[PDB]
Design a protein around this ligand. Sequence first.
Ligand SMILES: Nc1nc2c(ncn2[C@@H]2O[C@H](COP(=O)(O)OP(=O)(O)OP(=O)(O)O)[C@@H](O)[C@H]2O)c(=O)[nH]1
Ligand SMILES: Nc1ncnc2c1ncn2[C@@H]1O[C@H](COP(=O)(O)OP(=O)(O)CP(=O)(O)O)[C@@H](O)[C@H]1O
Ligand SMILES: Nc1nc2c(ncn2[C@@H]2O[C@H](COP(=O)(O)OP(=O)(O)O)[C@@H](O)[C@H]2O)c(=O)[nH]1
Ligand SMILES: [Mg+2]
Ligand SMILES: [Mg+2]
Ligand SMILES: [Mg+2]
Lengths: 53, 425, 345, 426
Amino acid sequence: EVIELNKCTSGQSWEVILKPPSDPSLEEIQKKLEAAEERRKYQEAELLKHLAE
Amino acid sequence: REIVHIQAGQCGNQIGAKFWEVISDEHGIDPTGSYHGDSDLQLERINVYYNEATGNKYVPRAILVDLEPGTMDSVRSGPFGQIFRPDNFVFGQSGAGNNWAKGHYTEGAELVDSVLDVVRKESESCDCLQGFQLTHSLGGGTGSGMGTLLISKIREEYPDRIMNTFSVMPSPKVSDTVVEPYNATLSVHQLVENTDETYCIDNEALYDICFRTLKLTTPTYGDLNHLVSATMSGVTTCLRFPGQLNADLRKLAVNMVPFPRLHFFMPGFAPLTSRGSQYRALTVPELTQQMFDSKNMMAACDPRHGRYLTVAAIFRGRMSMKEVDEQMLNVQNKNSSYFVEWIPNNVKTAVCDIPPGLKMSATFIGNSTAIQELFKRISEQFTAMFRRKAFLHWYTGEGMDEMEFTEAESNMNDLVSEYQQYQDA
Amino acid sequence: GYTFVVRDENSSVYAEVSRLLLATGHWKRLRRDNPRFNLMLGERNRLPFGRLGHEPGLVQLVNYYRGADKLCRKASLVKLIKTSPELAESCTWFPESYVIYPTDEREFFLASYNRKKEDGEGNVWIAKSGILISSEASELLDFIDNQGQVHVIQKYLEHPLLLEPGHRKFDIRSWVLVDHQYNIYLYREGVLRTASEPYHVDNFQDKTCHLTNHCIQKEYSKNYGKYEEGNEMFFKEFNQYLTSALNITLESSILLQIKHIIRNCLLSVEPAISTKHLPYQSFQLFGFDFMVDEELKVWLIEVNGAPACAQKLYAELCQGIVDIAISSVFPPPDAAFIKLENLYF
Amino acid sequence: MRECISIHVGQAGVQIGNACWELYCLEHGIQPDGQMPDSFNTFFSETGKHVPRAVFVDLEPTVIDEVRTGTYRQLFHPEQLITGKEDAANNYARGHYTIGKEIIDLVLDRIRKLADQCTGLQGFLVFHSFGGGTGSGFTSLLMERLSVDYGKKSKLEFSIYPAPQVSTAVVEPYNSILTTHTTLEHSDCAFMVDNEAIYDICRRNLDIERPTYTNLNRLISQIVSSITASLRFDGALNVDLTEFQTNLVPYPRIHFPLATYAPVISAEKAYHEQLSVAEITNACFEPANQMVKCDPRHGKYMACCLLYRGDVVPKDVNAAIATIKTKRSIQFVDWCPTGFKVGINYQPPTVVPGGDLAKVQRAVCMLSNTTAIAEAWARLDHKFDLMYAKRAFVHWYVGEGMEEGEFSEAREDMAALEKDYEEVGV
Ligand SMILES: Nc1nc2c(ncn2[C@@H]2O[C@H](COP(=O)(O)OP(=O)(O)OP(=O)(O)O)[C@@H](O)[C@H]2O)c(=O)[nH]1
Ligand SMILES: Nc1ncnc2c1ncn2[C@@H]1O[C@H](COP(=O)(O)OP(=O)(O)CP(=O)(O)O)[C@@H](O)[C@H]1O
Ligand SMILES: Nc1nc2c(ncn2[C@@H]2O[C@H](COP(=O)(O)OP(=O)(O)O)[C@@H](O)[C@H]2O)c(=O)[nH]1
Ligand SMILES: [Mg+2]
Ligand SMILES: [Mg+2]
Ligand SMILES: [Mg+2]
């Protein structure tokens, strides 16, 4: 039952121990976003092409 | 979030006119377009279906289409006939003679561009258009042929919008012509490709309900349209009133359509009213059992012959939400085999305080694999005639080729085999 | 009416339970991967308890109690007996055991072995993960180091109750069914896994007289099935031997201690495994293994989470599981299990 | 100083955000107009009026419009409330890609305006749902961009875990896995709030027949308030966002603490004779009081932090901890000290007047990093597996530019996460 008190103002805190143990870049995001945008644009183009037929 | 409504042909304009009379009443709009309602919870989402005109008038964002003036002249004279924008009446003089080819290729092609001019005008005046909803039958010529032609042209001009339809399926019990299976098969082929969601309103089911359930021996189109307008009111409640579930056409499609081609819904309603019926107010347990019963389905399919992929239930009126949840959970626990286990929580429930009319009602929308029974019935009838090339001259005479019929038949047979595949999964 | 899944085809007990459920027109068996079930006859290891009872409106029950391994594993049972407040000071029916790794209670075992050696007391110990019986600490510890995984050095009984004729060792297996409301039920019929070789002190390597394991007797005992079919004596034959040869009933000399041990064991782990505060319900069939010494004292040896039944008792035991544990939660439209209770109510 | 910016994304984030700020205002004696007749300056800025350092974002206006016209309309600056026209339709792909790309830059600018008013920004608190298209999709895009624009700042999450009782979409499991995968590297600590756990607590403890979002959000706000109290009052434990990471996050991926709050008592009850410490401390180990449905009895602890509020003295806390250990299933991993970090805020709990919660003299929120929370991932992953096996609804995501590859990549990451909890938890 070890206790370790830390700071005291509008209340208080402490620790009680019972027993011891034993980045994608901005460009990197934009490419993926635009890669999906083109896939969207392409699918829409395929649809409009099929409707044009 | 605006919806552009289009109604085409005799059926499309008759059910469409009723839908507008029904919701106009619900939203406190009188035949002159003026609001005189006892709640504002009627005007909160009024813009979804109505435009706001000069003297605080609400005008339906509806486009009335037909190749014959008859039905549209009947509308213009009916109770709410003056509510519609006069410019939005677009009609020809030579009808379609219940011929899909005439509506899609010849007579309809001559009138289609002028309809699209009205569609475009209504769309340009939308802050954010969600999509379109078309009412029509698949057995006639204008609604069936020209309606699917309109869908195709609209999709080309608005590929990123939702295309929703209320499609009346034909039946020998309530038939106008022997070529209905031809028209229906040709239209279903168009629907499978160019709609996001289609509410399958079966005339066979509407007839059997009027005859067997309501005991209306000798039912009229007016009797069938009573059920239709009531169902149409129920299925669109989530779009017309403030809500959280399926509040727009896209979220509805995302929740209801797991596979792109499988977007044909089986509506249901309770209680089944008869024009001028008697006294009681159906308890929540009674509403739930009925709306899930084969006898309350607007498509002549036995849900016990297939499985539900997704379901959307809507309760209207003042009732216990705890009781609704208990009853909804009970129907699934008592019939868990009829709901696909591979789509968790596939039954969603919504409640609206404003009832239709009635004190309390329940509307069902089910994407069931049993819907293949409807497509099988049509496919059987279509094949019986096509096998012997019966009545094809009326179609080939308009420019069509037999190959087009073989493709429509094949695409519908594929649709049936796809619904069966997911029933055996 | 109700639906069930079978996720353990190797379980002989629940294979019969499955057949009994299907024999009535109330139960339908779904594919093992279907989550829309009422009863789950789950797998022995890595059962998905987290996914249970989350399907709304559906009442789910599983044939296992999550956390029962803290009683059914050899090392965790030793840990439970020595550390539980309910057992640490009161347990007089568990042989002196120490967990051995190749925590490690190795130091404490050597202290106890040296105390018994100097005082001239019995010093035979048994090591189990592969079982070695010896009176030499050096021999016992070296055996553990050779094999991997944790062994447990238990005190070897040395003076067991021997069955006459034959003068042979035996162990008792009792079947205990704990239902959804934690009601402990002892199945009326037990089994004596007897040895078919005369028991002798010392030697130890004669595994046919020292180990009463059914597989050990079937494959190595030349007299297998000599006294009773499959080396399995029932409680009627055992009660008759007891009342005759020793002038005492089985339900007084041995069964009272058995009932006491079962209730103490299951209630020590009760707060850690209770499904009252969980979205699903649990039930489990346990296999309690006992050993009786010459002074008629019952000793708990092991607890089995997934036990195997005796051929003739399968029909009655599996029907009892269907009635007490399954039919209590899922009832159908319209005295073989003793409910173990405290002296006070 | 050390400021904290809150970002509320989608309906759940916004509506929960409204409840938290309503509570913070009551706790700090701030009126709806910002007037207040310092530690609280980490969440509020001052004029000549106390304005929340918060940003509300949604791809549709109707929910944020309620804030713009509600009781707390004066509280926020118009630029802090950002809305689009078209929502993500419960589709992660629409929120992250199609519609997200259109509004992201505007959001980052409005956030930059808040960051520019900070002398020493600590980091962000992001509130969002796992199930919504904006909550899942837009949030992960936002987190990705924030990691770029603010590199070393901390980012905490309050994630609303899906529950069928209140679920609005069948594809919520998909959105949950997709957002968790994308956000995992960019979140330092995430507090999951299972709506099912909150739902049941409202029914069981507050006797509410059918809980509404208002009921759920007020209970959620209390737990969120307990967690952020240390940042808004001088408090000695969890004084900064970095402290949450260090006291509760042993491994970067295992950053999901389980929150347990007590007592939750009905405002009308009256039989209440005030619960003591040890009564409330014991409740922290009752599954019925957890924010996520799981069994901590069968999960190993990596951290345990007790946050008391109100009339609490250390003596009682220590005595309570001492007894609890001898009567509970508190098992720690063999690589961690079996100890409890305790914090006491003498400020008693505040309740909303005319609310469902009763006002108490003392309360406690326990934040514990237990492997039992992995049950929540298992449930979600199983639902994802059921649908994905048949590719159900996948076309809606592919239609927005996504690929089936992202679905299996996100699922593989979740499989690794479930395995990480397994490795730690034995
Ligand atoms: N607790 C709680 N959950 C909410 C609330 N609002 C929505 N949810 C949950 O959030 C999920 C739906 O996500 P939302 O946040 O509503 O959706 P969104 O972020 O607006 O996304 P889109 O509508 O798809 O653009 C469901 O699981 C709802 O139960 C709320 O106020 N409180
Ligand atoms: N302390 C002890 N005293 C006397 N005999 C013992 C004993 N421990 C074990 N035995 C004997 O050894 C046999 C096997 O014991 P053990 O506990 O290992 O079996 P079990 O059924 O749990 C599985 P396994 O096949 O792994 O041994 C017992 O049936 C008994 O005959
Ligand atoms: N429910 C309903 N079905 C109708 C109505 N009028 C026609 N039908 C059905 O619609 C089909 C005929 O199409 P119709 O709309 O009359 O012709 P169109 O002018 O070519 O579109 C047949 O299957 C009829 O049974 C109506 O008012 N209500
Ligand atoms: Mg028509
Ligand atoms: Mg027609
Ligand atoms: Mg939204």
